[PDB]
Amino acid sequence: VGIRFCQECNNMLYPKEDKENRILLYACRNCDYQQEADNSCIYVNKITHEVDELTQIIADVSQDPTLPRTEDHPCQKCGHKEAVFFQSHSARAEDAMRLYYVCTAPHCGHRWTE
């Protein structure tokens, strides 16, 4: 879940409880715009942070000449031999040495983890 904005003054929506119909809604306190919430969640907190970093790493990192690269691990979709590998950057996890792999060819941006 994430932020949404009132469509007239483009300011924050924040949640309120309707007391009569007993339903949650979003109201921007700078105006009277009330919009019914569709997510029943207002706040989530991934305390253990077990999110895999594949979304944080970009495919453009394949052009770095100082990164190491091996022919051992092939890409899944195309099977180009060359794939640059590098370590995690999450500070706070149960592990700290796993290798993230990025396929090396110009158009195949495939990123995977073994």
Could you list the residues known to form a binding site for Zn(2+), using ranges. 6, 9, 28, 31, 75, 78, 103, 108
Beta carbon nearer to Zn ion, 75 or 84: 75
Q: Rounded CA gap, 67 and 72, in Å?
A: 16
Q: Rounded CA gap, 47 and 49, in Å?
A: 6
Is residue 103 near Zn ion by the rule CB under 5 A? yes
Query: Of 96, 105, 102, 108, which is closest to residue 73 (Cα–Cα)?
Result: 102
The piece of 48-56, 62-70, 80-88, 91-99 that touches Zn ion (CB under 5 A) is: 80-88
The piece of 21-29, 47-55, 63-71, 90-98 that touches Zn ion (CB under 5 A) is: 21-29
